């Protein structure tokens, strides 16, 4: 659902608006990560994975 930067509810395609277009009614998965870039490790938030 929501991020950590805006942290609002959401803006979402409504369900009856979603069944008239053959779309899926869905919400994105957000993760947070830290990893080894190089000289220094880096922690990056809200990566879209699905």
């Amino acid at each position: 659902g929501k991020k950590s930067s805006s942290s609002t509810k959401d803006y979402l395609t409504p369900p009856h608006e979603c069944r008239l277009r053959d779309m899926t009614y869905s919400a994105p998965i957000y993760v947070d990560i830290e990893y080894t870039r190089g000289r220094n490790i880096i922690m990056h938030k809200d990566v879209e994975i699905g």
Partner: protein, 50 residues
Amino acid sequence: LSIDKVLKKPNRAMEYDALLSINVHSNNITSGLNRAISTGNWSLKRFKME
């Protein structure tokens, strides 16, 4: 295995960043979930049962 296919390079080990190539693999989560709900058969691996 998409990481070390790049990390098997002498030059490509300092400035290489990993989140650039995350979105090629993200599409197997969405298309995995939507195909297993429409066509109602779930092809698992851990229990190997259909």
